[PDB]
Amino acid sequence: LQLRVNEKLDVENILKDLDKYTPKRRGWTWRQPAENLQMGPFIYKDASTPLENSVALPSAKYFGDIDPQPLPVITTEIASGRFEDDIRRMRMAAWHGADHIMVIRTAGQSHYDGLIEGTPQGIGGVPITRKQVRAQRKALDLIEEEVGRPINYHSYVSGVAGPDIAVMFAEEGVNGAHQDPQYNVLYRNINMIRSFIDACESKTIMAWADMAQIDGAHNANATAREAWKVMPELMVQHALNSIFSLKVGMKKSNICLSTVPPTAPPAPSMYLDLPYAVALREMFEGYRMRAQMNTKYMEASTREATVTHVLNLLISKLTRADIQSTITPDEGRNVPWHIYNIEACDTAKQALIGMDGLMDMVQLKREGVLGDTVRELKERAVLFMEEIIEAGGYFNAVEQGFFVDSGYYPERNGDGIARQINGGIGAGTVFERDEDYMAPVTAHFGYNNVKQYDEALVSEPSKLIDGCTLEVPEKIVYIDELDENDNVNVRMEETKEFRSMIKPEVEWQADGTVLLTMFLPTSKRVAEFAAIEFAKKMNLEEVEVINREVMQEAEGTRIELKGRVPFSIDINSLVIPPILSEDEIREDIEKTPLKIVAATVGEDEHSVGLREVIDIKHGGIEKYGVEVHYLGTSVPVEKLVDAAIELKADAILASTIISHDDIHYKNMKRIHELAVEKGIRDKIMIGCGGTQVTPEVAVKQGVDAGFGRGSKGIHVATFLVKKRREMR
């Protein structure tokens, strides 16, 4: 119901009636290619359908504010701990091109042995529950209607309640999710038997939902000592979750490889990452490539991150990315702020658009060093499999510590992670099914004896109970809150005040945080602290130095700080006032020709100033088609006029630089008088400028306008067209 572009999203109105919300859509959506698309002056080889409402790249202003959208579906990561604040950032992000909103879970939700309910406060992520999901997806339904292009809701089916969360996601129309039982074992230490048995069930459910699945390979990048050696392992994990998923019954087009280029500068990164990128995509023809951005070799400089992320988009463009995830360029500096999600989204939309149809003009030298390494990596991958097989399959491989090893396989440093086939979270929670094991629900995986109740229902185990929740949404049990203190409505009230005052925020409504960039003429430690003092003396609470870059050990250091603004401001308490374009100026002079005489006047030899507002170089009136007749310098006032008359000029421009004894105003006045004496004063425009000129003091002398320090041609031209109209 509704949504207006100028009216804030009503979250309070969204938290309402949740017990009767259903999704509008089920499944993942891709972007529609829009072949040979025309937008503004240009034609686009690699664009998809444009949005109905969006915010263009700043510089789009020079091209009619077109906002073309790239082929790959674009992700951003929004999860602040409070979903209700996050929804607003979603709206923001969606207008900047995002159609994939991914919600990292609350710290170690992987360990929760079942669903959670309600809206407790997250920690390093949002606690995923049916309430919070219904809220966000309801909101996104709205937002996607607004932007005009379906949005993909995404989160994590991981840990010990995989099956649980898979069901909830399926029901509540979650469009994408991470699922990789390998993740559970390697990094979360969850019993390998328990989790690979669970995955079948989860993946089967996600299959039912036509959900896009992303895997966990990228976590290998992160754990690895040197990510440039982890590629043969990377190709095995990807391979393992893919065949496994495929076999469970997922579509090859829903199985997505999560693939981050391993290195970043100063390493020769394109050189290292490109051949692996090419190998990966050759081996998994048919599968989806989910390109994600580097976070390992990232620091606190947002600039650094942006450049390296561009090289990440280049990698995707030289090869393929069905999905292109993004990393906020401040990910290494703090928890993502609103503004840096939008930075990410702009960057990705920006580079890709800039790389439009680039493969029509560039191609891979597949036969050369590139080809050779591509084969080499595939072979190291194959060997890796052989050795797994050769030691009793997956489980023994993990036990023997094949995984997370800092060596470049077949090289083995013997420092990998090893898991007990019998240890871990949920050890000995695996039960054998008997001849008569049954489950009367849709999308169940393993042995299900229904024949003991009806040979004819074997393909419809839900018919045993007149449909399961997957067929009868009504049957789903909605739970609203469990904790009366740690919830959203308790949170929405600690801030209802700000819904007509205002203050700056970074993640959560009114949190008062802002960023401070400065440079100090001393070394890094001294400057780090001086920075904090300045920040303090600005009225900032909770001051942190978040970035430190050395300009030069001795000449100075850049510092970046966050802090808190302890006050608010009343919108009502601000006084806010309420412009001819270069095209308007140009058009007016094009239609009505406009002729000027200009001079540096008197005994003045300073010529630069007048010429600075005439020459086309720095935006002088010449640019707009004004006919400038220039007399030179040390021109007499009497002379200037006589020419204005001879040439039937429309305006006189005079430069007045030397200002000794008010000689500059004195000549301004002699010009007005000289024109009056000659009866052209009412038929002419008289403009005068100079270093010591004050526009008011110059009008008082009788001339039409005065210009001083900082005059540019646009100003003088705006004055010539406006004043001329005013006289007709």
Partner: protein, 110 residues
């Protein structure tokens, strides 16, 4: 490399053959795991059955907690509730519900 002498038996494969191998060995590795999946269940898998049947998360947990107390998992926590309702002539929900509060397990054991 080392690597060089280990890839010896790979040198003469074609790119198609090397890929085909990779994948058939991939399938060979996960097939056993897939099996474990067919032949076994877990607390989460059972709770997830209950969720799909009309029960809540809190309820599902209680029903499975008592299903494990009786080594009954082997039958299927969803199954139990079913037989239990088709036996007493009651609603899938009332049965399941009853079981969540330690009722009808006497019956369940037979």
């Amino acid at each position: 490399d080392d690597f060089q002498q280990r890839r010896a038996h790979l040198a003469n494969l074609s790119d198609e053959e090397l890929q085909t191998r990779f994948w058939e060995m991939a399938e060979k590795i996960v097939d056993p795991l897939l099996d474990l999946g067919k032949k076994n269940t877990t607390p989460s898998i059972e709770r997830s059955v209950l969720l799909r049947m009309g029960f809540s998360s809190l309820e599902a947990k209680a029903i499975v907690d008592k299903t494990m107390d009786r080594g009954l998992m082997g039958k299927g926590a969803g199954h139990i509730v079913y037989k239990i309702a088709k036996e007493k002539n009651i609603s899938v929900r009332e049965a399941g519900l009853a079981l969540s509060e330690g009722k009808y397990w006497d019956d369940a054991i037979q």
